[PDB]
Amino acid sequence: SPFVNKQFNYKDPVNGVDIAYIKIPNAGQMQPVKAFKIHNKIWVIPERDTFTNPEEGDLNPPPEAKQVPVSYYDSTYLSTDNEKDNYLKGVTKLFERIYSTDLGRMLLTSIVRGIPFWGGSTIDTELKVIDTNCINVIQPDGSYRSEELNLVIIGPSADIIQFECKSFGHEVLNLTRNGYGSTQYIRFSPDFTFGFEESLEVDTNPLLGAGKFATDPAVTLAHQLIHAGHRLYGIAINPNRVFKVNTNAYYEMSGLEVSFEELRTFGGHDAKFIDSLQENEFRLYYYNKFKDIASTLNKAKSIVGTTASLQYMKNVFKEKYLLSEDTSGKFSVDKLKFDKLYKMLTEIYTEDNFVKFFKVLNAKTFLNFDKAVFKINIVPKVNYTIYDGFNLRNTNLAANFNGQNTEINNMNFTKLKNFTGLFEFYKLLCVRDLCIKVNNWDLFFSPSEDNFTNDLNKGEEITSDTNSLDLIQQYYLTFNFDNEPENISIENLSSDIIGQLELMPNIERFPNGKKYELDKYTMFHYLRAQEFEHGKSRIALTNSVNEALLNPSRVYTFFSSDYVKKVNKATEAAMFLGWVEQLVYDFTDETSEVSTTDKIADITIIIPYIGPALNIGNMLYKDDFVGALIFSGAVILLEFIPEIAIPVLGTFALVSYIANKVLTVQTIDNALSKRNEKWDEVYKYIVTNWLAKVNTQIDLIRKKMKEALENQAEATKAIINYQYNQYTEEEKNNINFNIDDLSSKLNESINKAMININKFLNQCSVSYLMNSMIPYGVKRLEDFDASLKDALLKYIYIGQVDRLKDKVNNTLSTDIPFQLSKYVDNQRLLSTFTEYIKNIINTSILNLRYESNHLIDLSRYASKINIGSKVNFDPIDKNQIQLFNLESSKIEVILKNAIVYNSMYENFSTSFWIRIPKYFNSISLNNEYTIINCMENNSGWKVSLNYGEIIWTLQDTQEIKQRVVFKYSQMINISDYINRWIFVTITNNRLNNSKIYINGRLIDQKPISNLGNIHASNNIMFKLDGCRDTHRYIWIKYFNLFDKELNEKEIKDLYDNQSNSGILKDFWGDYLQYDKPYYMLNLYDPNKYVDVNNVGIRGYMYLKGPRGSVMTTNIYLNSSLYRGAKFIIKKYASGNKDNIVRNNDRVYINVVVKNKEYRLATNASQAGVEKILSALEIPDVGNLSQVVVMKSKNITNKCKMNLQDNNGNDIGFIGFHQFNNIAKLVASNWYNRQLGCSWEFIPVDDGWGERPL
Amino acid sequence: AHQYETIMDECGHGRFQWILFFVLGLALMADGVEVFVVSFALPSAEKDMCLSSSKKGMLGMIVYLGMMAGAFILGGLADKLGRKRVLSMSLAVNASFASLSSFVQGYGAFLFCRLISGIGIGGALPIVFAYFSEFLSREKRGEHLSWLGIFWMTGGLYASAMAWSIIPHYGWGFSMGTNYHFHSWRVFVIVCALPCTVSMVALKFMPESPRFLLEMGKHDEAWMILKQVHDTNMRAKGIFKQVWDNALYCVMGPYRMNTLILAVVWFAMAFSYYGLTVWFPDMIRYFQDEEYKSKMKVFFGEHVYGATINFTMENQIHQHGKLVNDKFTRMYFKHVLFEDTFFDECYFEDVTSTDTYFKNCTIESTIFYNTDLYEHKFINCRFINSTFLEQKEGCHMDLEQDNDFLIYLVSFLGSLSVLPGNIISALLMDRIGRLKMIGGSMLISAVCCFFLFFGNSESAMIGWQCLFCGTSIAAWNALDVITVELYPTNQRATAFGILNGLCKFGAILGNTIFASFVGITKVVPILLAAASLVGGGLIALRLPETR
């Protein structure tokens, strides 16, 4: 069943029921205008709107253009019969298209049902129609028949492509916001459509070209219908409730009014810009209005002005407002049904839902402004089908939304000249001249802090009882049909219906052309530096903005100097074709570049050119940009820092019931539930603030990146075309070059770069959200949790205390996880948030790492990282920090005071890699010295050391102390914990236990539940305190703190990640290095050392022991290691300029005998699988297999060497075979068929203390 | 007995008795080498080769106790079973178990094998003397028997003379962790079973005892052996109940006073002689040790700076030394002691130490590379920043200066000194008699013993040993003759066996007491030995006459 029945053409007679001359209300006297009814209470008037508004009597453009991004003005539109018929067909087709959709069907049914309320009677016990909510259709006989209607569609006013929904007001009553409702006249035109540009679609169609998409008129008509539906039930927000912004700064939009009504109508992302408190206020206000009108309906008992019985009218209004009578004629509202109706009219009917149902493109947010005016034709079915629209099926327009792309579907949209000039509303920026005008619609959107309000501070009292397409489909089944208010005979009114439109608030004109004087080159300056005029003279690229803005015929570019040198070079025809291909290759190379440094937290893909592209942070070096990025987080991208402040959350007042057993458990359950509700509400408020104030800037930066890339591509294309133009005719025809393919490939390269830029910006936005916004709310929530826990425990103070205490302790000890999926519905951002949550390090609280010649807290919780003047950093790997026993060899960490909560350190983890040299002096015995301190007022946790012991101490105010110790002996042949890197992690849970793991294996655990008040601290002291030994020192690196207990799996994952398996390691655990002599030790036989025997072909190398003994009585006794012939590793094919060896490197091995080097080689032709190794003079024969590939992974198994032949055949793993009595060294292929193939490199170290005799 | 004596007199002395005398002197040689290998080989085998200087233990002596049982088990049995069969079995078991002892790993099994070998051989001497006593002429009986004695002494001499040639290195007993080489003790044990092996080869031809055979019965066999002996001489000249009652019949019966006096004399001689024979080498070793200990150099407050040591320093003690930046390379430490010495960055290379011991020393920054200075050589020492690299395996001693060759050479001279003193008793026992000789020799040896207090020197000690041994062999010979001549042929083997067992018991007593009283006093063991000799030589007169 179609919506509009029996299509009307235009020139059908004046019958009087479906096509007739009508007289709408107006200020004075108006000639009757032919209007056609398309459905119940819906009329269309194919005429220009010059009747309702007496001021709008002219069709010429006004002298002062409106604050509008795009607008088309016309005078001859809709003046001919063909134009009116085309308008009618377009409107009817759009109505049918909306009606087909289930959501559209519900919207049209609701609009038809919702007639305006009859409140025109002065006496309170009567119902009378509003005189301004009705029309007069004049019959051909001569008299008129006054009729009541709901919607009217009129062609647009002077502004052709300005669509709005007007209403006729009353003298005292606000019909559109008090629930009474009033008729809505929509100014809509289907022949014209705004055009936008979309740059976030490549995720589905990478083959797509440029943007320039055309808005589907069905969506616009749906938006107007939603406005009419809101105003028909009288629940529209007052127009003065407007989303105010700031305009003083130079980076702010001069003026952009957006009422709360538009935010409600847009829905989706836009509707989140209004906090929950204002939604609650509006819902309560409109509930009170509905109750008031229900009471008014109840009181009245008489009706004047119509034949129809009163009971029918009361039933009509009851089914419109979903009132609930109780068989006694007593109408009343119920909260459930009104909540359902309000949610349907506010949240279900939204433009985003219509976009999803129609499956068409639209601007996801109102910030993505329109750009052009497109004249379109809707009547023919070959251009716009009823079911699909511009995306016609079974054609090339079916996929990738090619039906809405103006550059593919050119024949369907005609571009028009919009009257708002590109520089009509601008801001004039310049430095201390070169002043540039920047369009107002190309500036950052900065909402004020007034629009966000909180009721968090206000307290709450608890008593016994204190409490998606599938959802749309469920509403569709639940919806009621088949009941549409039947047409009612109304006694005819006066010939002229006097009535004035609803009064609108006055909008002051924002000032134009404000002059700003700054001290730096802003991003708009860089963007306007890259533009040019497509002039006749040659255009040359340059790297100096100070000259690009000054000289019109020279364009700035952020690419490398080689590219600008190339594109500026005069090339003959014989090399032109090669030149173009080289140019496109360099374009792809520069745009697709990425940043290797990844130690950053989820900013893995850093795009360097962005720095010089916009002058981000006011540095013009890509390396400087990456350094500043790593140093300062995602703050440098933001133009202005949002100010987020959560008030102290209110307390929970618990009522006590006398001698009751069930209600108290209900109070406890209610308290826990409301705790969860408070957590969710604070998280939602923070998400709303972040979406309103942060993501908009990132989106603008993304759009500006796209614009800059387009500008660079256009500049290169213009240079190429100008060079082509210079040739002679024979040169052009012999050497043929076309522009379309070049443009297509440059566009594809731009898209390829744009994917990476989008990923980087999404990662930055999510990182900022989870780093600089969430903690400020988590602190408040957990402080509130601690405050509520004591009140609950006091409240428990019948016969069920133990279970309740366990429940409350376990409930409030932990925290509710933050999952973004419950607050936003953006797939692209949710994927990156899941990636952020995946890594454990990203959720750490303190993440001290050395990056870009600075020791910084990558988790951004620390305020001051103070470094002493006697703290050493290893030059090869600067992460390893060496701390001495000096008063000035300390590191201090001062955390942010507004992030640290009092009840921290209840469930938390710590992890660090530590290297402790051997204990030499006898003073070290029975001497405990703190190496990490976080105690204030004798309370907190400290990591201390002792003779062969690592101690973790937890102490409370009452002087109670709990210690967990890990003890390793020094009197062993070979030790895995003496002067070797060990990964110590400690996990404390206040409820059950505190445990310490060494190298990812549980070592010790002890209860801590007896402790009292462990009052948290703020400073962290990396300093050796109380150590009596004067030369004592330690190595510490990769310190990390976590705000939750860590299970064994996470500990093992941390050990695997931080181990850095890509780099082979020596005995002590450092990085293996080239051109360094290491002694060799075999793990299979650690009691024997490698020795050489008659260097040359006829000699070999074997293993002989025992190693020996190094002793200090009463202190230590360890087998000597600096024994045997030293091995050095000379590079062979490593392209890296550093001397650090890595996995699968190919290397040469030299053995030192009598301070002379011999290459480690063998002859592989000898019989048997075993190939005994030998040492040969470096001027040897290259035919012998000598190249050794070093491996450290299979799971990692130490450091293994694999002898390879010169032809790539694998001779096999190095190792030892007991070839007769003498245990020789061999390259065996048995070891390749996986011990004895695992080795350890022992370099001379100053922490071991053995003298290499 | 008259007819047997007359026919034996008519048979005379010729080829057969000489051949038998040789094949029995072989067994007496075996007895002598057993006494040597028990008294001067085992007691030096338990020594510590590692200690360049060691004492003397007597663990092996227990085999002497075993000899006792043999001298009563294989000694008294022969009188009830036979003389050729018992000697054959005894020497056969001795030879077999000695050869088995040669192929033995471990000290315990070797000592058990030596004990059973002693069991076998301890019953040889009574049987050989009783055997040869029933073959020689009655008138010319004292001479030839006396001659047999020399073989006994020769045994020790031979056992000594070869010993220093084969095993002049103590500690070969308590060491089984060594390689299959160093088996000089193995070949020595193999070759010490040579005389018994040749005697076993020889005894197949010799016939049984004619007098004993006649005593048992089968007088035709006795007549046959008498005829064979006569023909050889002409051609040349041209049951344990019964045995225990038999032993009791030798003591608590008609033979009561004679056996008591004989037992007293045998105990006295086997006490004094077997005490002094082992006392003398011990005394000479103690004299050498004292001469060594006199030249001990005490060092106090030294400051040795930057000195490289290349030679050998011996017999020194250092106290409060401060050895700074020294260097000991390829040298020998001999009997040198360190106390309270403070080393400093010293270097030890290829240093070989013997009996040196570090005490309370502070050893700092040193290197011990290629050395045998093990942990046990350090007593209450504090190392500082030191190291212990490759270390020579096994202890090392300058065996050239660690050979107790003298202890075997002295025994050789002591056993040799009796040869001139035995002939003057062989061709004399038919003139002075059989009781004046024993008493006179005992008293003269006692007088010589009382002169030993005067002497204190190496030459003096060896001279006194030679004199005493020379004048204490006629006593043994006269004792053998008087103890083989008294008892009849039905009790001779048993009584000789019990007397030999008592002799071995006295050997144990003397070789324990005298060898223990070294370095404590000299007049006590000498006075005790002189008293024993005087008592024996005064009691031996109160014996029945046999002439």
Ligand SMILES: *[C@@H]1O[C@H](CO[C@H]2O[C@@H](C)[C@@H](O)[C@@H](O)[C@@H]2O)[C@@H](O)[C@H](O)[C@H]1NC(C)=O
């Ligand atoms: C062990 O010696 C201790 C200190 O004596 C040192 O004196 C120096 C002067 C030098 O000789 C070092 O070699 C010494 O070690 C002393 O206090 C102890 O009491 C000594 N112990 C004993 C029981 O001798």
Ligand SMILES: *[C@@H]1O[C@H](CO)[C@@H](O)[C@H](O)[C@H]1NC(C)=O
């Ligand atoms: C003593 O030292 C010197 C100097 O090195 C050396 O030539 C000599 O061989 C050493 N003495 C001995 C016996 O080796």
